[PDB]
Amino acid sequence: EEEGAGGGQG
Amino acid sequence: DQPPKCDISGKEAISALSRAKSKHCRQEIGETYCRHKLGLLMPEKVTRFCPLEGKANKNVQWDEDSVEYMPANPVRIAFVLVVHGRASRQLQRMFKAIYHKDHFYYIHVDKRSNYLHRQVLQVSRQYSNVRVTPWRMATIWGGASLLSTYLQSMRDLLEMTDWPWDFFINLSAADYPIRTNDQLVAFLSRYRDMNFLKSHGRDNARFIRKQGLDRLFLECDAHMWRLGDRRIPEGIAVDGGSDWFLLNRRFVEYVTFSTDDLVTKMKQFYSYTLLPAESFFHTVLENSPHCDTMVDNNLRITNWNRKLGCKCQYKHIVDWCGCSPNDFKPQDFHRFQQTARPTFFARKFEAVVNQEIIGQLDYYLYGNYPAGTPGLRSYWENVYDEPDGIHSLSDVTLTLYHSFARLGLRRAETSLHTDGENSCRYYPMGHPASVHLYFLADRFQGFLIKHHATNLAVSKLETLETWVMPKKVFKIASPDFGRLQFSEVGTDWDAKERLFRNFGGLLGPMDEPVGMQKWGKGPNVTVTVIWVDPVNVIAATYDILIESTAEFTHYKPPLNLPLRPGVWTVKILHHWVPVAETKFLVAPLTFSNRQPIKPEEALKLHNGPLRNAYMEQSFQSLNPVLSLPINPAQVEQARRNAASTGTALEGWLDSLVGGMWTAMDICATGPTACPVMQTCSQTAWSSFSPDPKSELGAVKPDGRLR
Ligand SMILES: O=c1ccn([C@@H]2O[C@H](COP(=O)(O)OP(=O)(O)O[C@H]3OC[C@@H](O)[C@H](O)[C@H]3O)[C@@H](O)[C@H]2O)c(=O)[nH]1
Ligand SMILES: *[C@@H]1O[C@H](CO)[C@@H](O)[C@H](O)[C@H]1NC(C)=O
Ligand code: NA
């Protein structure tokens, strides 16, 4: 899968 | 309370000010906001020094030959281990796999994880090429402090002239190698002028927004506060991805000592950034004079599974939603043998979740241990250590750990068959000295408690370890074949790994229990759940739909507190047909603020909900239909029990505990007068018994420990 742990504002 | 230096109108800043606890934290929030409001905090334009028009991504020829040769000038590696938590024995196992006398190891332990730090100190004292960071930060998840940690450790390592290292590699306690050290050194010796960083691989504008890079953050009071919006600086390209990487000494020297426009402004920008290590090094490198050395590959395999890993589970730590990769399982072993691209490490691994896959990897790389080696299928993890103090426990765990020790002392007395003096009668002394979780073949076996007691026959103090195991309570009532496989009650449900992190299911009157069910494949179905308290009061009832694809379901009913102490029961029905049931224990507490509970305290805590009802809705109508009559005698005895303290309260507690737990065995750490008690080091289950896979000895002729 892709990288990067940020999931957005919510 | 001093008013701010500027008018504060941002909704995000106001929210942070309202939620912050310390005045030092509120002051820093206001200063940061006001400085940004005047345009004096963030840089707006930055110089780009890279001669290239875009990215480089210099490929690496991944053939078999590139790894098998023997280098004449092998690189020496500086490993930076950033660790936290309780899993010291797994960290020792992984350290064993990666160790070589020619490398270097620099270990940062979260300021909060004092137990783990004491264990790491023992390792650093044994080997001349292992050191611990003297400074220790509270490196919260996603915090800005993680980049501060990496940057300080890089400066430290450069000033250690006695350590001539060529590469920088960062690892956590949940990483593990998937290739031998010889193959790692051969590969890096071939590409020693390259840097290995992995980009996100998607729309770059979406990456910036998902990471919150256009938002201003501040780390304070072990929390990442979101304070407002900000602009991405113009003139540079912003990139990011994984914050696990490998960087050569030349680039680390540039990042550390350069004073040019790029490095200076990026260290300022990323001091107020969420997840900074996931884009700082990408952004500097691609815009620096070293831009032509980047390889779009971090040589890692990260077990991302966002269907399970993205649950916005860090909202209490950061003002943002985040994701985490999953733990590997035995079925994933084949993924480590791929040779599409070069890879040398992987994450994550957790021994309390699945140790089998760890063993398969270690034996595959470095071979089996000798026949007759003990402890290979076991795992021990310390969850309380005396030097940290009973105030680091809660009133619940302190109460129950005390009860488990008494359960062991009663087993010692019972196990001796004699008509003379009983040389196995004990009187407990003080508080528990340590507590361990115990696993065997990836199955939880219970707690191991180390404690002191006086042997009454000889009137001498002895140190013992007790093993307690919970009794099996899940029962299938079906006669007929449904989808239910298991049912459980607990707290701290881990949505990513689908398990309770409160492994023992230890509960008190002020806890909010969670009910979980596990399902197999099959058509849709609807079932009924019923919660029953120790005197047959029905606390809650609800129906739930089980979709054909559902594997787990859970729900936390809103029960008024405090819960009545005793053994609760949870039942599942299908159109009034019994399906299954399980039990759980709400233990009465013997301590208040780590002190013996007082009569007025106990009466308030152990006599049921304050509002005299678990819910506004009442379920008295269901008691006869389900054959749950409320015995007037048992109710009154529960009231008498609520007023008890001291010895009467201890007998009530131990009676309940003894009905839900079993003292499996008890051993002595040193000499003992009890003739039927084995020495702990000679048992198969004690935390004192041999565990060679996690033990670190002398350096072998080949420079290895494994
Ligand atoms: O409270 C904490 C949390 C985390 N950490 C450290 O921070 C690093 C990442 O922690 P975890 O491995 O628990 O985080 P994850 O499993 O979610 O990792 C994933 O998401 C977060 C990103 O920073 C990671 O790079 C990514 O792999 C570890 O080295 C860990 O030891 C602490 O020191 N203290
Ligand atoms: C699941 O139940 C039945 C099973 O055949 C199906 O027809 C229905 O559409 C699904 N959803 C429900 C019942 O809510
Ligand atoms: Na040392």
Coordinates of C-alpha atoms in Angstrom, one line a residue, chain A, chain B residues 210-211 215 226 278 304 306 320-321 323:
Chain A
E1 CA 0.0 0.0 0.0
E2 CA 0.9 3.7 0.0
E3 CA 3.0 5.4 2.7
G4 CA 2.2 8.3 5.1
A5 CA 0.4 7.9 8.4
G6 CA -1.7 11.1 8.2
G7 CA -5.4 10.3 8.0
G8 CA -7.0 13.8 7.6
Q9 CA -8.9 16.1 9.8
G10 CA -11.6 13.6 10.7
Chain B
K210 CA -3.9 14.4 4.5
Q211 CA -0.7 14.9 6.6
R215 CA -1.8 23.4 9.5
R226 CA -3.8 22.3 16.2
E278 CA 7.7 11.8 7.4
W304 CA -0.1 -1.3 5.9
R306 CA -5.7 0.7 6.3
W320 CA -5.8 14.9 14.0
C321 CA -6.6 11.4 12.7
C323 CA -3.1 5.4 10.8

